[PDB]
Tab-separated table of C-alpha atoms in Angstrom:
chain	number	residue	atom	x	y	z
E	1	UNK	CA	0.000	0.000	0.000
E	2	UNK	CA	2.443	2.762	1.250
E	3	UNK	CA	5.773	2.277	1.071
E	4	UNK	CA	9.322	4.929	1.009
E	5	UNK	CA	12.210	5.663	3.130
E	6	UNK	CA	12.584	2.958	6.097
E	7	UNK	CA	12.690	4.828	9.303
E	8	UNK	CA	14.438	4.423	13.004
E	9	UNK	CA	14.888	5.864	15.979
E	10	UNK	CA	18.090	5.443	18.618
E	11	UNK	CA	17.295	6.012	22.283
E	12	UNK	CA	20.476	6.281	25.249
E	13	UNK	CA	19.643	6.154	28.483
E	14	UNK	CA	22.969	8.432	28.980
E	15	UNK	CA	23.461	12.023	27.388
E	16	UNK	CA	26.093	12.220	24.429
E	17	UNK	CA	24.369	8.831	23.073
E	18	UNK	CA	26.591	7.054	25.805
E	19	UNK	CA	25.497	4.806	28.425
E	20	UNK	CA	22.593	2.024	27.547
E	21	UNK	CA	21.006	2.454	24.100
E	22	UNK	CA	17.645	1.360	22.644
E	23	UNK	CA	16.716	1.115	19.042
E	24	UNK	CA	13.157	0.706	17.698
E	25	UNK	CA	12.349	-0.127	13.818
E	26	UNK	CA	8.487	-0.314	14.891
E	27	UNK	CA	5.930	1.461	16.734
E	28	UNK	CA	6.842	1.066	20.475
E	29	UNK	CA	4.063	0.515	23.407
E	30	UNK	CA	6.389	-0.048	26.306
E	31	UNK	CA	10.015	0.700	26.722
E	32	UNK	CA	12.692	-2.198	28.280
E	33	UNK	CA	11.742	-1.464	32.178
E	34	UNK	CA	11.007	2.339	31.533
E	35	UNK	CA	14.382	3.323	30.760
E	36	UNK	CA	14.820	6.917	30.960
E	37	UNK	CA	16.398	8.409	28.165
E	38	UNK	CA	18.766	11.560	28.000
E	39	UNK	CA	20.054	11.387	23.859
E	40	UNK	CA	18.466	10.119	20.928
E	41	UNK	CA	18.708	9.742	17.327
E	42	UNK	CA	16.366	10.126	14.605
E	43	UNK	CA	16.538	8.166	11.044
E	44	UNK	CA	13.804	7.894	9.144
E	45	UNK	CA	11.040	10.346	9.530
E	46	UNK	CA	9.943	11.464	12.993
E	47	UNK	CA	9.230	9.820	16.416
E	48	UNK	CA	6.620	10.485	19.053
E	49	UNK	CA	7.615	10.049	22.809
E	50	UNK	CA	5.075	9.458	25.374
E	51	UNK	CA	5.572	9.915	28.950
E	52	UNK	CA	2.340	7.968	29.734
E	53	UNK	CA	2.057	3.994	28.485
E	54	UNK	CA	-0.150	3.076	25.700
E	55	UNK	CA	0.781	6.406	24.190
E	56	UNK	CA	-1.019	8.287	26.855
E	57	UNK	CA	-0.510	11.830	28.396
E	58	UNK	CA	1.974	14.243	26.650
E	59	UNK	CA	3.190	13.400	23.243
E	60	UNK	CA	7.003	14.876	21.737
E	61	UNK	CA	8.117	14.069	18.301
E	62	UNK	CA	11.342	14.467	16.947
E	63	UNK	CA	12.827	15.528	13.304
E	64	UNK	CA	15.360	13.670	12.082
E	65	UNK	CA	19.010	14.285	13.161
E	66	UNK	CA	21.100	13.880	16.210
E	67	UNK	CA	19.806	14.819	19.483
E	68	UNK	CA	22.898	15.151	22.357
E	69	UNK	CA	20.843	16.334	25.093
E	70	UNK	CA	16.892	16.722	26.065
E	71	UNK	CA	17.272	20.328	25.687
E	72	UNK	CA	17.959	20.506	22.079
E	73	UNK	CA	14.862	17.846	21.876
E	74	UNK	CA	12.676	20.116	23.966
E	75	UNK	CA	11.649	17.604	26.228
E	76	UNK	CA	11.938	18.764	30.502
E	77	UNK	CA	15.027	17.501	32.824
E	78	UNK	CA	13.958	14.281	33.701
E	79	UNK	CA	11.441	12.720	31.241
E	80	UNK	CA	10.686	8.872	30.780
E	81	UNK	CA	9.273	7.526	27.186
E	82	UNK	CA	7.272	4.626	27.850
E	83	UNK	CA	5.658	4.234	23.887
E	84	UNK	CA	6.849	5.279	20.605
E	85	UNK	CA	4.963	5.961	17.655
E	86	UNK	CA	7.176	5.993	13.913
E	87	UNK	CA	5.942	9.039	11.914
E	88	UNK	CA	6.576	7.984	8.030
E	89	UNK	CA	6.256	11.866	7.711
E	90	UNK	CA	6.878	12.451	4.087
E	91	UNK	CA	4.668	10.009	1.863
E	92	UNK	CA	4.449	9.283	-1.656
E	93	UNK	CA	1.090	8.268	-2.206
């Protein structure tokens, strides 16, 4: 049906992408034992990070590029994604 540029998204529980790391080809409902996450790392159209489980409460996406810190993401000091939602963003049709 709809098909383009694969997408992918790089989570680290660390800033700098250092420490543990997470990577998730598919749309996410629960992270491995709520592990917070400082960096991440776009690929692939953008990514949706909710606080809440079964992508409940407040929603942040993110473009694609390299994200060092929350900051630059936009997200508050001490934020845990529990679901992830894969945005195909750009779309033939």
């Amino acid at each position: 049906g709809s098909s383009g540029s694969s997408g992918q998204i790089h989570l680290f529980s660390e800033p700098q992408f250092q420490g543990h790391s997470q990577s998730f080809e598919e749309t996410t409902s629960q992270i491995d034992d709520s592990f917070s996450t400082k960096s991440c790392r776009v690929s692939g159209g953008s990514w949706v990070v909710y606080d809440g489980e079964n992508f409940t409460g407040n929603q942040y996406v993110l473009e694609e590029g390299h994200y060092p810190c929350l900051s630059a993401m936009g997200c508050p000091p001490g934020a845990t994604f529990k679901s992830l939602r894969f945005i195909s963003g750009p779309s033939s049709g």
